[PDB]
A paper describes a structure:
Poly(ADP-ribosyl) polymerases (PARPs) are a subgroup of four enzymes (PARP1, PARP2, PARP5a, and PARP5b; PARP5a and PARP5b are also known as tankyrase1 [TNKS1] and tankyrase2 [TNKS2], respectively) that continue the reaction (PARylation) to generate long chains of linear and branched poly-ADP-ribose (PAR) on target proteins. PARP1 is involved in repairing single-stranded DNA breaks making its inhibition an attractive strategy in oncology especially in those cancers that have defects in additional repair pathways. Thus, TNKS activity promotes Wnt/β-catenin pathway, and TNKSs are potential drug targets for the treatment of cancers driven by Wnt/β-catenin pathway, most notably colorectal cancers. We determined crystal structures of the catalytic domain of PARP1 and the ART domain of TNKS1 in the absence and the presence of the ligands.
The TNKS1–talazoparib complex structure clearly reveals conformational change in the protein D-loop upon ligand recognition. Likewise, in TNKS1, ligands stack on Tyr1224 and make hydrogen bonding interactions with the corresponding backbone atoms of Gly1185 and the sidechain hydroxyl of Ser1221. There is a single substitution of Tyr889 in PARP1 with Gly1206 in TNKS1 in the D-loop. Tyr889 of PARP1 is seen offering van der Waals interaction to the bound talazoparib. In addition, Tyr889 is also poised to make edge-to-face (pi) interaction to the fluorophenyl group of talazoparib. These additional stabilizing interactions are absent in the TNKS1 complex. In all structures reported here, a structural water molecule is observed (except for the olaparib-bound structures, where it is displaced by the carbonyl oxygen of the ligand; see later). This water molecule makes hydrogen bonding interactions with the imidazole sidechain of the catalytic His862 and the backbone amide nitrogen of Tyr896 in PARP1 and analogously with His1184 and Tyr1213 of TNKS1. Talazoparib uniquely makes a specific interaction with this water molecule through its triazole nitrogen atom, which serves as a hydrogen bond acceptor.
Author numbering: 1105 to 1202, 1205 to 1313
Write the structure that this text describes.
């Protein structure tokens, strides 16, 4: 099954992942309601996720997408927050579990703070299980930093609800715009198009 390999804080790989997590924090339109109020995280640990079966499905799909995109799979490393991270690291992403702006897909953010708004559910739900606080500064949260095969992407500023990527395409990118999205989002419609590469355990920090 799945093996988690702990990254040391002195490793350049650990440092690269933390830097991407910290530097992509942005100012949210809800004032912190969903994800909590913070300017930085406290990273507890970063683990590499190893799953032979998930890797095989991912690599198989990556080759199909590369062939349909002029031999370029076009991967991006993107964040994913979910109260179901334990199932994802064992079973992978599953599009069958997909109100989304781009329809029935699997969603990722390039801004870690956007994925953080989803760690405890839509709008943060009732927050951490122990204290029922969306802004809990004690409980450890988890998010994934994933390899996402975008292939030939379809870029949009406004909502476009679909069941699958458009013909010939492999993903949908929602870009920010005035009167549109605040931050980008990336959507795939096949679970095998993402690999949950890193598992980050963290706390948000009180300003
Ligand atoms: C609530 N939910 N369930 C599965 N995926 C999600 C959300 C989501 N989860 N996780 C992320 O990191 C994320 C990063 C984004 F840029 C954008 C996202 C998400 N939108 C998703 C969304 C929001 C409302 C909705 F009705 C359906 C889907
Ligand atoms: Zn708590």
């Amino acid at each position: 099954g799945t093996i988690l390999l702990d990254l040391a804080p002195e490793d350049k790989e650990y440092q690269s992942v933390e830097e991407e997590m910290q530097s992509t924090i942005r100012e949210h339109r809800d004032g912190g309601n969903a994800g909590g109020i913070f300017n930085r995280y406290n990273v507890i640990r970063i683990q590499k996720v190893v799953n032979k079966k998930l890797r095989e499905r991912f690599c198989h799909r990556q080759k199909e997408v590369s062939e349909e995109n002029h031999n370029h799979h076009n991967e991006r490393m993107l964040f994913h927050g979910s109260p179901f991270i334990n199932a994802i690291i064992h079973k992978g992403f599953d599009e069958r579990h997909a109100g989304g702006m781009f329809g029935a897909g699997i969603y990722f953010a390039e801004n870690s703070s956007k994925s953080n708004q989803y760690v405890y559910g839509i709008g943060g739900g009732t927050g951490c299980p122990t204290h029922k606080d969306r802004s809990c500064y004690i409980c450890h949260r988890q998010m994934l930093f994933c390899r996402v095969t975008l292939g030939k992407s379809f870029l949009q500023f406004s909502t476009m609800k679909m069941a699958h990527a458009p013909p010939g395409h492999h993903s949908v990118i929602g870009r920010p715009s005035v009167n549109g999205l605040a931050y980008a989002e990336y959507v795939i419609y096949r679970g095998e198009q993402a690999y949950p590469e890193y598992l980050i355990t963290y706390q948000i920090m009180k300003p």
